[PDB]
Write a protein that binds this ligand. Structure first.
Ligand SMILES: Cc1cc2nc3c(=O)[nH]c(=O)nc-3n(C[C@H](O)[C@H](O)[C@H](O)COP(=O)(O)OP(=O)(O)OC[C@H]3O[C@@H](n4cnc5c(N)ncnc54)[C@H](O)[C@@H]3O)c2cc1C
Ligand SMILES: Cc1cc2nc3c(=O)[nH]c(=O)nc-3n(C[C@H](O)[C@H](O)[C@H](O)COP(=O)(O)OP(=O)(O)OC[C@H]3O[C@@H](n4cnc5c(N)ncnc54)[C@H](O)[C@@H]3O)c2cc1C
Ligand SMILES: N#Cc1cccc2c3c([nH]c12)CCCC3
Ligand SMILES: N#Cc1cccc2c3c([nH]c12)CCCC3
Lengths: 588, 588
């Protein structure tokens, strides 16, 4: 019970003190540790409804019953007088660096969650080190500390989204009385990349400073787990060496995948190259239909690019497919060409990349349709976006004993633990979890606090809100319509749906019936909202708030009784009434 | 009990039928009424957990116990065979127009809630009429059906907001690689008003069509309640006449207020004139500090106007005052001049409005500071925005017996009822209620359904979300910080707060620490979120979703455990930690 919790907190904490806020004698020892710059976690026993039980239970270790007690790395250090004896006699910081290992904590992977974990760990006294290498792309693209979001993901994509919507700011700017001529402005790619790279720069720097000011040894080195507590590192100078840690965290994320065909790796790029590209790609083939694939097709189009997407099977597999279809129909209606049910066979080269003039090469793409017909067409740039995958063999010697799944990802209990007890994994290599940057951040912080601070809080992986930043934005929460039938049966599912139109689009003369939204509720369980969907502007802002109501289990009636803000788009959700079952049309 | 509910539903319904979905004999009578185009409400007894009790209780009226039973205006009409006897013998529509009054329902006021009520009422068979007059402003400004939001409120203001933000689209458009020169574009006022007026036109028309297709007699006439069931109307031709109604609904909203000083009414305008102004106002005095006053100062500035606001007392009285201050400091830092603690004495005229050249007059404003000092300065346009007020004496003869409060508003029970039983009020003349367009809409629909359909649902007036559409937008939900102390005491209040910066502002080189947000929770009641506040872009979208969680009573831990969407602004709310109490700084 409580019994058993507290033996784990004492064992795993680097430095921990039990106390009471109403106590001079706890206060006087805190003061000694602030001054000697000794960092620690602290449990105020007068603040848990468990504190009496623990205060007596503590004695199993300390053979005493009173506050304060200080432990260092599982070992009882002493009460008040003995601590200040260790201090007055100049013996403190030598016992507080007593460790069977170099580091309390070694984090392989300096990305989203990996930095999140390290930062929170050193807060509570754990001697923490953090390791990052960026494997260069086939053409040599490489970036700075921070991981996939910062450098080749959510941050550079979304700014590049923003530059695309500004293409319709200027269109609309005319009808609202501004005296520009949209039809005579042009977008410049280099100037756009230059700023996006300037901001990424300042993120790279800010993380290095953050780590340095928390006492975290950053180690620009490729790291491998040979034994449970032995991590082996290799630097830029190719020097080898082993470091040791009590607890080891695996947070190395993923990297892009390539179709096995002639020409791919040679003459094609991916997401990692695109965001610091030194020239505008020009005519572009986007192979793939993931969110990454449509989003990148999206801003390329919006910045005057000539864009084509080659769709193997469906658009956005695993999302609601009505919204898929709607998402893509906006993009077709606004430029982006789709090659439907189609698949590459080989890339040949017609012109080499000209790295003096900032100009692309030129390509011949050869592929086929599923019905038989051929596919042949020329393109200046070919971007593959067909999936991401981890590469744990480079990182995790199969001999240590961590159970990978069939995909390549790690099997973890609901506290992120691997089949070796001193190792854990978070981020994209956790199996069957949401592969999202704030999800990683959520895991790495809550896990840190349980290893080095006695926290019990788990991460809730369910019902995590998402948004795709396509020309029209799509934001989502919960099950998609088709699944929620496949689980409770059509009869048990009612759906409320509606078109709409942002007030801003009225004067701009935009479309009457493209925006859409729907609630998928369960009849039998009090009409409980099972999933929520919206396509229109600012879907991220519109969605995120409803992620809370839903995590508390909201029903339709909660939506009905709550009052809207006007004029907004989001206020349509409070007044829905037309059901799919009814057959009444959802227009305006 | 149930007993008593059902005598009210039978009494007030114009035409109502009790039935069961599993019934051929109910079906066969519905078919007869669809064909004769007879409209009605319908209670399926096999769908309430009260249905057995009612089915027997019904007999108090019908002396029978079986389905279906049809009543018209409180009178039992017959079972199946007798209804189709009335029909085969060509006697139906004559009994279904049996009424002790011309209309079931007379709605004085053709605005937000007033139209909302009328529309929902005629759905369930009630012979409904709707009345609207627009009292011309002192200079003669007048508009079409729809009310204050449509014509001189939320719709024309917010589009005019939109034209203001597009002023910073074009600024930012440069840094994202677009080849315009922001510094050489100018805004044209006439072209902007022209479009906003085009959209309002199409709203005016759409309401007239809506009313006409629901069978609602629209009566462009000024209406007055002389007796409880007698309403007297006067048209454009000044013709008098009386109409009679069973139930009477008061929904005439409000109109603008004027300071009692020389020159005001003569040489000044208000909100009603501004939105169809035929010239750009130029140099403008904004007297007032309501939301209306800052919002209008806001877009005038953003469209290059030279703008000044004269603040009697505080900014935005009744909102959080930290957010007030922050709101205004953005506007000062972005142009808008504030004359602090200051008050007009008189307006004199230097030039008359020149209505050929589309040019304003010119004014001399004379006023004083509260400390003594004088105020004297010239201005091309003076906009008064010092409060709205109803004028019920024009509408409601004091002799009938409806209890007004001290302000001028009506006293209603929590079902919108006036001290006369057949009369009700909704919208801005309901006392002590939120004066918001979707609030009016919410009252007018739920009230309709209870008068003519047996509904029991009330409107929940508490915790209604708001947003001010100032240059920086401020959206709000719940108590403001100062109140939530004044009710539970400082010790019981914890506050979580944080700065932030939209990812979009990064490349645009906008400000590091202007955006702000905070959660005001109650320690003792499980840290329950009492109010929520945000200042940044898209506050309306950002807020509205959290209006639901809060209506279900969300606590901080609900925010902590829910996962964010990234990059958005809204995702800061899921990761708050710094408390005001702690004193840790909220920057970035
Ligand atoms: C184009 C794109 C856009 C995206 N947009 C969004 C979005 O808008 N929102 C969202 O929530 N998610 C988005 N994602 C997903 C998001 O990036 C991931 O959830 C996130 O990056 C996962 O973080 P992580 O901490 O698991 O690992 P990563 O961020 O991938 O970081 C792990 C780091 O460890 C390094 N590493 C690997 N092996 C070693 C080794 N042996 N030694 C040392 N270092 C090593 C890697 O190079 C990397 O820098 C996007 C992804 C892509 C590709
Ligand atoms: C500038 C401005 C901006 C606003 N912006 C917002 C916003 O963004 N969001 C929001 O929620 N609220 C906003 N409001 C408030 C919103 O307009 C009100 O809540 C709403 O208009 C109230 O509607 P109502 O149905 O009570 O009456 P009204 O909309 O005022 O309609 C009543 C109608 O009845 C007419 N009438 C009066 N007397 C008679 C009579 N004797 N005979 C016939 N007809 C008569 C009136 O002329 C009017 O047309 C704004 C208000 C203003 C002034
Ligand atoms: N299409 C599109 C699109 C997608 C998202 C946001 C916007 C905005 C405009 N167009 C948008 C024009 C001005 C208002 C903001
Ligand atoms: N200041 C300001 C302001 C207020 C509300 C929204 C916005 C946006 C910009 N400025 C904004 C620039 C482009 C992104 C959208």
């Amino acid at each position: 019970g409580t019994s058993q919790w507290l033996r784990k907190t004492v064992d795993s904490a680097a430095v921990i003190l039990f106390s009471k806020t109403t106590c001079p004698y706890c206060k006087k020892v805190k003061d000694v540790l602030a001054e000697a710059k000794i960092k620690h976690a602290t449990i105020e026993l007068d603040q848990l409804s468990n504190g009496s039980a623990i205060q007596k239970c503590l004695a199993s270790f300390s053979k005493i019953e009173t506050v304060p007690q200080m432990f260092v790395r599982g070992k009882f250090i002493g009460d008040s007088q003995t601590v200040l004896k260790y201090y007055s006699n100049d013996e403190l910081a030598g016992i507080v660096n007593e460790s069977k290992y170099d580091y309390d904590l070694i984090v392989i992977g300096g990305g989203s969650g990996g930095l999140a974990a390290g930062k929170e760990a050193a807060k509570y006294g754990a001697k923490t080190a953090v390791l990052d290498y960026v494997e260069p792309t086939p053409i040599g693209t490489t970036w700075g500390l921070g991981g996939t979001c910062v450098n080749v993901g959510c941050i550079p994509k979304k700014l590049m989204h923003q530059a695309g919507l500004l293409s319709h700011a200027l269109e609309d700017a005319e009808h609202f009385g501004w005296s520009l001529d949209r039809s005579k402005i042009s977008h410049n790619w280099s100037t756009m990349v230059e700023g996006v790279q300037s901001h990424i720069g300042s993120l790279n720097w800010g993380y290095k400073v953050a780590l340095r000011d928390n006492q975290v040894t950053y180690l620009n080195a490729k790291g491998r787990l040979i034994s449970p507590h032995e991590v082996q590192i290799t630097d830029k100078n190719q020097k080898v060496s082993t470091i040791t840690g009590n607890k080891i965290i695996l947070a190395t994320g993923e990297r892009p995948k390539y179709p096995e065909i002639p020409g791919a790796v040679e003459y094609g790029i991916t997401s990692d190259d695109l965001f610091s590209l030194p020239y505008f790609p020009g005519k572009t083939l986007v192979i793939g239909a993931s969110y990454v694939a449509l989003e990148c097709a999206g801003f390329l189009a919006s910045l005057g690019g000539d864009v084509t997407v080659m769709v193997r099977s469906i658009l956005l597999r695993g999302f609601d497919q009505q919204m898929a279809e709607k998402v893509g129909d906006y993009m077709e209606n606004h430029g982006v060409k789709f090659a439907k049910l189609c698949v590459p066979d080989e890339i040949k080269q017609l012109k080499v990349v000209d790295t003096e003039n900032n100009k692309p090469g030129l390509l011949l793409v050869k592929g086929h349709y599923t019905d038989g017909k051929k596919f042949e067409e020329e393109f200046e740039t070919v971007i593959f976006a067909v999936g991401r995958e981890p590469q744990l063999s480079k990182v995790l010697c199969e001999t240590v004993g961590v159970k990978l799944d069939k995909n390549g990802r790690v099997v973890c209990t609901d506290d992120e633990q691997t089949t070796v007890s001193n190792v854990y994994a978070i981020g994209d290599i956790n199996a069957g979890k949401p592969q999202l940057t704030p999800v990683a951040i959520q895991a790495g912080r809550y896990l840190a606090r349980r290893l080095f601070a006695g926290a019990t809080e788990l991460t809730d992986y369910s019902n995590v809100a998402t948004t795709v930043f396509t020309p029209l934005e799509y934001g989502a929460c919960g099950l998609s319509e088709e699944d929620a039938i496949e689980k409770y049966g059509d009869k048990d599912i009612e759906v409320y749906h509606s078109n709409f139109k942002p007030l801003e689009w009225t004067v701009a003369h935009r479309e009457d019936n493209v925006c859409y939204m729907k609630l998928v509720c369960r009849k039998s369980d009090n009409m409980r909202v099972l999933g929520l969907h919206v396509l229109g502007p600012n879907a991220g802002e519109i969605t995120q708030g409803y992620a809370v109501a839903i995590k508390m289990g909201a029903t339709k009636a909660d939506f009905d009784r709550t009052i809207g803000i006007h004029p907004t788009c989001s206020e349509t959700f409070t007044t829905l009434h037309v059901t799919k079952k009814s057959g009444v049309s959802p227009i305006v």
